[PDB]
Design a protein around this ligand. Structure first.
Ligand SMILES: Nc1nc2c(ncn2[C@@H]2O[C@H](COP(=O)(O)OP(=O)(O)O)[C@@H](O)[C@H]2O)c(=O)[nH]1
Lengths: 224, 441, 31
C-alpha cells in the first residue's frame, strides 16, 4: 500500500508538513473571499472559493491520491464555536468556518479513523487561520513599505512619530508575537510528532502501536 | 513565487557561478542542466521551480540574468557551465563596453539603455508563475554596481513598483583605491538606500579570515571565497528550495528580519562547511563575532533584530537551552522589544546527513547597530578628498559629464543620504528615539 | 501519620492522563 507515502501526504495536507508554499498558495487569491464569510450570511457565495479549490484539484499531481480525495466544506460554526464542546477550551463569554476533510477507502480507513480525521481537521483549521492572519500582517508590512502615502516627508515629528513610527512599532510587536507562536507550534509540537511517527516506522512490529501513536500525537497537539 | 537573479560584473557573476554550482549540487540538478537524480521516481521533496526553469525535456536553467557591461564576465560563466545557463535572456551592453570601474560608467549604460535591460527582464517575468521579488548581487562601488546595479534599482522601481527589491552588498575598496571607490560607493548607496527594500553586507575580512582557516591555500582572497560565500548565501532560499513551513517566502521573512526598512542591511554569521555539531552549539557559535560577516571591535553591540535558520540533525531541546544567551548576551532593543526568531531543518536530501552525524549548520543574521564599520569607510573617506575637488573627474560619463556642477552635487547629496543611514543606525539604538512614538500619542 | 502529599510526578502524570482522556472522551462520547 505504501502507507508511508500516504501518511506523509496526509501530514502534508493537515500538519503543513513541508507545505509552506502550499499554504501560501492556498491563501493566494482565496484570501479575497475568505475575509467576507464572517461578514456575510450563510447564503454567501461559498461556491466561488469551492471552485477555486476545484480548479486547483484539476491542476494536481496524479499520484497524490490524498490531495485528490481532499475536499472543502463550510460550517456556520467557526473554530471557537465548534471548540466550545471541548472541556478544556473556553468559549467567548467568530471568523473562520472553513473545514477540510477526506474520504478514505477501507484499506486505509481502518487506520485513518473518523476520530483522527476530526483531529486532523480541527488542527489544520487552527494552523490555517493562524497562517491567514500572519500573512495579512506580512502583506500589511509590505504595503506600509511600498505605498507613497506611507513615505511622506517634511510634515512634522508629531506625525512621523504618531503615524509612521507608531505603526511600525505596533506592527513589529504584532509580528514578533504571532510569528513566535507559529514557530513554537511547529518546532516544539508538530515536528516532534512527525518525528515520533518516523521513529515508529523503524521496523515496527505492531500495527496497533502505530495506530496508537497516530492518535497519541493528535491528542498531544490538541491538549497543548 | 519565481525569483530572477541579476548578476553585476565579477561580483555578481563569479559568486553567481559558484552559487549556481552549489545549487547544482544541492538539488542534484546538474552543472550542465541535466538532472543528476535517478529516473526511478517521479516525485520530489524539494522545489527547484522558483530558481530553475524546467524545460519540456526535463532540462534545467537558472532564473538569472548576467549583467551587460562586462561581456567577458558573462562569457566566463556562460561558457564554463553553459548547459545550466540560458544566454538568450542575457542582455549585453549596446556598445559592448564598460567605461571604467565607476558609477558614471554603468549608470550611463543603464540610463541610456534602461529600456533594453528592462525588456530582457520583463520578457522573462512573463514566462514564469507569479514572480516574487528581484534578487541582485553587486560590488556597491563598482561599474556594474555603483553604476548599473544602481540603475537597475531605479529601473525596477518604476517598471515593477509592486515587487520586492532585495540585494546583496559586498565590501567596498580594500586598498588605497578607496579614495576613488568611496565616491562610487556613496553614489551607489544613495540609490541602494532610497530604492531597495532589504539587503545585507559581506565583509572582505571574513572572506579572508575564513579562507586562511579553511583552505589549505591561505593566500586566497576574493576568488574561491566566492564558493565560501555561496554556501553562506544558500540559507536565504533553503526554506523555499527544500521547503519548510515556518518561513517559506520573501514577504513572510522580511517583516521578521528588518521591521524598520531604512536599516536595510543585515549582518550574517555562519559556520563554513565543505561541499561543529548540536543545535545548542551551532546557535551559540554564531553569537561569536569571529563568525560574523561584518567583523569589528564591537563585541558588545546592540541589536534591532536577530534571526536564525538551522539545517541538519536538529534537536529542539538544545535550541531551548541555547535561548539562555538570547536572554544573556543580546543587548535588548529597549526601543522596540524585539526578540530572536528561528527556523529549522530541511537538509538537502541529496546531500543527506551522513551516518553517525549529528551536525547542523545554519545562518544567523541580524540587524545590528554597530555595522557602520562597513559603510563609514566610504562616507568618511570620499568626502575628505571630494572637498578638495572630486577625484573621479576622469569618469565624467553621463550625468558626471553633463556638468561639473552635477559631479559635485551628486556626490554631496549622496553623502547626505548615506549620512542619514549612519544617523539612523545610531538613532535607532536610542530608547528616546522610539519611546516618544507611543508616549506622545 | 505524617500529613503529607503523595509523590508529585505521579500527581502530574495522572493530571496529564486525565486531561488527555478528558479531551479524548469529549470526542469518544460521540465518535
Ligand atoms: N566578495 C567579493 N568581492 C569582490 C569580488 N570581486 C570584486 N569584489 C569587490 O568589489 C568591489 C569592486 O567591484 P567589481 O565587481 O570588481 O567592479 P565592477 O565589475 O565594475 O562591478 C571591490 O570592493 C572589490 O573588493 C568577489 O568575487 N567577491
Amino acid at each position: 500500500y505504501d502507507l508511508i507515502n500516504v501518511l506523509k501526504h496526509l501530514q502534508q495536507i493537515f500538519l503543513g508538513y513541508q507545505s509552506g508554499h502550499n499554504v501560501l498558495k492556498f491563501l493566494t487569491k482565496n484570501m479575497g473571499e475568505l475575509t467576507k464569510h464572517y461578514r456575510n450570511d450563510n447564503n454567501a457565495n461559498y461556491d466561488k472559493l469551492l471552485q477555486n479549490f476545484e480548479l486547483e484539484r484539476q491542476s494536481e499531481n496524479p499520484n497524490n491520491l490524498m490531495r485528490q480525495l481532499l475536499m472543502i466544506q463550510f460550517d456556520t460554526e467557526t473554530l471557537p464555536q465548534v471548540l466550545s464542546h471541548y472541556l478544556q477550551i473556553y468559549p467567548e463569554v467568530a471568523i473562520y468556518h472553513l473545514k477540510f476533510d477526506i474520504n478514505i477507502p477501507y484499506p486505509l480507513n481502518i487506520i485513518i479513523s473518523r476520530t483522527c480525521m476530526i483531529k486532523y481537521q480541527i488542527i489544520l483549521r487552527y494552523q490555517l487561520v493562524l497562517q491567514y492572519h500572519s500573512r495579512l500582517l506580512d502583506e500589511t508590512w509590505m504595503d506600509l513599505n511600498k505605498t507613497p502615502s506611507w513615505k511622506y516627508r517634511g510634515y512634522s515629528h508629531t506625525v512621523k512619530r504618531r503615524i509612521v513610527r507608531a505603526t511600525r512599532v505596533l506592527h513589529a510587536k504584532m509580528n514578533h508575537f504571532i510569528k513566535t507562536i507559529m514557530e513554537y507550534f511547529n518546532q516544539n509540537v508538530i515536528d516532534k510528532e512527525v518525528y515520533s511517527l518516523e521513529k515508529c516506522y523503524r521496523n515496527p512490529t505492531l500495527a496497533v502501536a502505530i495506530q496508537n501513536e497516530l492518535e497519541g500525537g493528535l491528542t498531544n497537539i490538541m491538549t497543548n | 513565487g519565481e525569483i530572477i537573479t541579476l548578476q553585476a560584473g565579477q561580483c555578481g557573476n563569479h559568486v553567481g557561478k559558484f552559487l549556481w554550482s552549489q545549487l547544482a549540487k544541492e538539488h542534484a540538478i546538474g552543472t550542465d542542466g541535466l538532472s543528476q537524480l535517478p529516473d526511478s521516481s517521479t516525485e520530489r521533496d524539494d522545489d527547484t521551480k522558483p530558481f530553475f526553469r524546467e524545460n519540456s525535456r526535463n532540462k534545467f536553467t537558472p532564473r538569472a540574468i548576467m549583467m551587460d557591461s562586462e561581456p567577458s564576465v558573462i562569457a566566463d560563466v556562460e561558457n564554463t557551465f553553459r548547459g545550466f545557463f540560458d544566454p538568450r535572456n542575457t542582455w549585453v551592453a549596446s556598445d559592448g563596453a564598460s567605461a571604467g570601474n565607476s558609477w558614471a560608467n554603468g549608470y550611463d549604460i543603464g540610463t541610456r539603455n534602461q529600456d533594453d535591460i528592462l525588456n530582457k527582464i520583463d520578457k522573462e517575468i512573463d514566462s514564469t508563475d507569479n514572480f516574487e521579488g528581484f534578487q541582485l548581487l553587486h560590488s556597491v562601488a563598482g561599474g556594474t554596481g555603483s553604476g548599473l546595479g544602481s540603475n537597475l534599482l531605479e529601473a525596477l522601481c518604476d517598471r515593477y513598483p509592486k515587487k520586492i527589491l532585495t540585494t546583496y552588498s559586498v565590501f567596498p575598496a580594500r586598498s588605497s583605491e578607496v579614495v576613488v571607490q568611496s565616491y562610487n560607493t556613496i553614489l551607489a548607496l544613495r540609490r541602494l538606500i532610497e530604492d531597495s527594500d532589504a539587503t545585507v553586507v559581506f565583509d572582505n575580512a571574513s572572506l579572508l579570515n575564513i579562507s586562511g582557516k579553511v583552505f589549505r591555500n591561505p593566500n586566497i582572497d576574493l576568488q574561491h571565497t566566492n564558493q565560501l560565500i555561496s554556501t553562506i548565501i544558500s540559507s536565504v532560499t533553503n526554506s523555499i528550495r527544500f521547503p519548510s513551513y515556518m518561513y517559506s517566502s520573501m514577504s513572510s521573512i522580511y517583516s521578521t528580519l528588518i521591521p524598520s526598512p531604512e536599516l536595510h542591511f543585515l549582518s550574517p554569521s555562519f559556520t563554513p562547511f565543505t561541499s561543529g555539531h548540536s543545535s545548542y552549539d551551532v546557535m551559540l557559535d554564531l553569537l561569536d563575532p569571529s563568525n560574523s560577516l561584518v567583523s569589528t571591535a564591537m563585541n558588545n553591540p546592540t541589536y534591532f533584530n536577530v534571526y536564525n535558520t538551522i539545517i541538519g540533525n536538529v534537536e529542539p531541546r538544545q535550541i531551548s537551552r541555547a535561548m539562555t544567551k538570547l536572554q544573556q548576551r543580546i543587548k535588548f532593543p529597549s526601543w522596540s522589544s524585539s526578540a530572536m526568531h528561528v527556523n529549522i531543518g530541511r537538509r538537502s536530501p541529496y546531500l543527506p546527513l551522513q551516518p553517525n552525524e549529528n551536525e547542523v549548520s545554519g545562518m544567523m543574521l541580524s540587524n545590528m547597530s554597530t555595522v557602520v564599520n562597513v559603510f563609514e569607510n566610504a562616507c568618511n573617506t570620499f568626502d575628505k578628498v571630494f572637498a578638495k575637488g572630486a577625484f573621479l573627474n576622469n569618469y565624467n560619463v553621463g550625468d558626471l559629464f553633463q556638468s561639473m556642477q552635477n559631479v559635485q552635487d551628486e556626490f554631496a547629496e549622496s553623502r547626505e543620504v548615506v549620512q542619514s543611514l549612519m544617523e539612523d543606525y545610531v538613532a535607532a539604538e536610542q530608547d528616546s528615539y522610539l519611546d516618544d512614538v507611543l508616549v506622545d500619542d | 501519620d505524617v500529613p503529607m502529599s503523595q509523590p508529585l510526578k505521579e500527581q502530574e502524570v495522572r493530571e496529564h492522563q486525565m486531561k488527555k482522556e478528558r479531551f479524548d472522551r469529549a470526542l469518544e462520547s460521540k465518535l
